[PDB]
Symmetry: C2
Subunit: 289 residues, 2 copies
């Protein structure tokens, strides 16, 4: 009964506004929102914090909120740094974003997190508009642009362009790499002045387009303690040990090797942890044919 | 009913593998914790434990490496290893026991008719503790923390015991040996150290491994259990334990091993309910080294976010 979702300020108000997106009743959640409305030009929504466990997205989004008042040349940029603050309520949060934010933007940039248990390459993932989405994605000049075969559905259910930058909690994340990349996308979109620059990653200034399919998505054959045996960006040969699975019911039993099925690059890899059978423990990727 | 017991004989010469059976109780069925024992006759006795907490797997992994290496490397004595003392926690991805909510370490020596954590503690205390003089715990500092590969030594009033334990700890040759009177000694510490007068060594694993391997090998050499040829000593006091003044998103601004000056920003706190409000700086109270620091995460007011340390007086 009581109230629909609402914003605490008017999005048509020129300049900078800060307020909340109130999601109706657990009780009401008030998600802080930043909006800079500088008229005609590109309209972009930036979201972060799907995983309350890994906050590099939210930190990058807050930095952007402080910087955009001086740098934003035109258009409209809405920033919701933390989408899952408590992290049904998840349906109602999705609904609030769909009703109040998605209608006003043409593009959505999700600062998506895999969680603290994965390491992954600083990158953009993509699953006509595909050509547009892929060119815009490459314009970020991140170390990897991945063609990988739900929030993209919401965004697609309004026919908007969806860009997904991937964050993980492992050693490979690189916050300044992601900053440089997001700035390159805002430059590419025409929202801020400047020239795109590849950030230095692993002592290099390069971008690479890779693809991943089912054979490259390595899964555990059975339950146990997964131990990674490679790092993000490692070039592996077919048959190389990507990780080892240790059994928990016995210290005499053998461990199981988890091997790469083809020559490929380690895009993401799980940290050491207990996994069930058929759980993905490494994402490999290869260059396009 | 059933008492806790081992499924094999510790006095069996050579390498044995089996289980420690924790009987059924009021909250769950019996548990079988795998145990390794390498008996090479007369010499030092040692228990090595991992997996007291469930979100730390480097200890369990290191323990399993020792299980495979000690059959050829152990020269004498007896080494018992339990790579995961809290399988319930390891499997639930939880810090403490998911059934009873208890931190297995703080409940030692437990009780046979208590909750699951208490029965696990009772089983270890009745069957493993009485046969060892030294316990090595491969301890989870916290997966939300990055900390130096180290041993944290808690000051105690018994001078010889403190001297012996600190010397053995330093002989591991890890990056840091940290003197710290944290008073988080309920359970296992009080049991082994104060009640039993034993050598208790805690190696620290944060959530941020060949260092640890080499360290534990040096430790084993120093204990006379493995033959071979095998570092900063720092202290942390209350002014070195930095806390958030209010709830928000903590953002670290320094890394483990960084040497910070008095007044340097160690981290920043971003307020949770506002994008207009300014962030709060969390500063070092003295020139010190970063021993441990939290990962970017949500914190409540007065939560510890960084542990700084200073070199011990020479």
């Amino acid at each position: 009964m009581s109230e629909a979702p609402h914003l605490t300020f008017d999005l048509d108000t020129p300049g900078v506004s800060t307020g909340h997106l109130v999601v109706p009743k657990c009780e009401a959640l008030s998600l802080p929102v930043f909006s800079c409305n500088r008229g005609e030009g590109p309209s972009l929504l930036i979201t972060g914090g799907n995983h309350g466990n890994e906050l590099q997205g939210p930190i990058l989004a807050r930095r952007l909120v402080k910087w955009l008042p001086e740098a934003q040349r035109c258009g409209r940029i809405i920033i919701v740094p933390e989408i899952n603050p408590l992290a049904s309520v998840s349906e109602r949060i999705a609904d609030a974003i769909s009703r109040l934010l998605l209608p006003v933007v043409d593009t959505v940039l999700d600062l998506h997190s895999f969680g603290p248990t994965w390491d992954c390459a600083p990158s953009i993932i993509s699953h006509d508009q595909m050509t547009k989405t892929v060119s815009i994605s490459k314009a970020f000049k991140l170390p990897v642009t991945l063609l990988w075969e739900m929030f993209d559905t919401l965004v697609h259910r309004q026919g908007k362009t969806f860009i997904c930058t991937e964050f993980g909690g492992g050693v490979v994340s690189a916050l300044t790499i992601y900053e440089a990349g997001v700035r390159n996308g805002l430059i590419a979109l025409g929202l801020v002045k400047g020239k795109a620059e590849y950030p230095t990653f692993r002592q290099q200034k390069t971008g690479q387009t890779l693809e991943t399919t089912s054979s490259d998505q390595l899964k555990s054959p059975s339950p146990g303690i997964f131990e990674p045996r490679c790092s993000v960006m490692d070039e592996v040969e077919q048959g190389d040990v990507v990780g080892v699975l240790h059994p928990m019911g016995s210290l005499s039993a053998a461990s199981i090797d988890i091997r790469a099925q083809s020559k490929s690059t380690v895009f993401a890899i799980r940290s050491a942890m207990y996994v069930q059978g058929n759980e993905e423990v490494a994402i490999l990727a290869r260059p396009l044919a």
